[PDB]
């Protein structure tokens, strides 16, 4: 509350702690369904169903330009990816089953790192 504050946490190194765990996802061989925004000419539903498309680009556009105020929105955008691709995607597809790996590669780098 008003002048009760727990011990200051050093938040500096935040901004290039995500880009790290951002190159390490974007470089994972599974990465290739998350690069680039999902083309809604092109996939039919996907712009009626998904109401908040997400990719790894847009990701790394808003961190680069100062469009997260901390680490939960950065967080809340890449789990947003994984969300979206299991609500398009059946787990038995290789885009499904790529969506269960990058999160588990994403939550360990997040736990790991913070
Ligand atoms: C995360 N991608 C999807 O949920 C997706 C769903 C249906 C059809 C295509 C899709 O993504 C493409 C993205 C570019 O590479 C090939 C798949």
Known sequence: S???????????????????????????????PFLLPVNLKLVPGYKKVIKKPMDFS???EKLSSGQYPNLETFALDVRLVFDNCETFNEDDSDIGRAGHNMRKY????WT???
């Open 112 to 114: 790991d790192t913070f």
């Open 106 to 109: 994403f939550e360990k780098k």
């Open 2 to 32: 008003m002048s009760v504050k727990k011990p200051k946490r050093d938040d500096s190194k935040d901004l290039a702690l995500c880009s790290m765990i951002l190159t390490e996802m974007e470089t994972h061989e599974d990465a290739w």
């Open 58 to 60: 847009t990701i790394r």
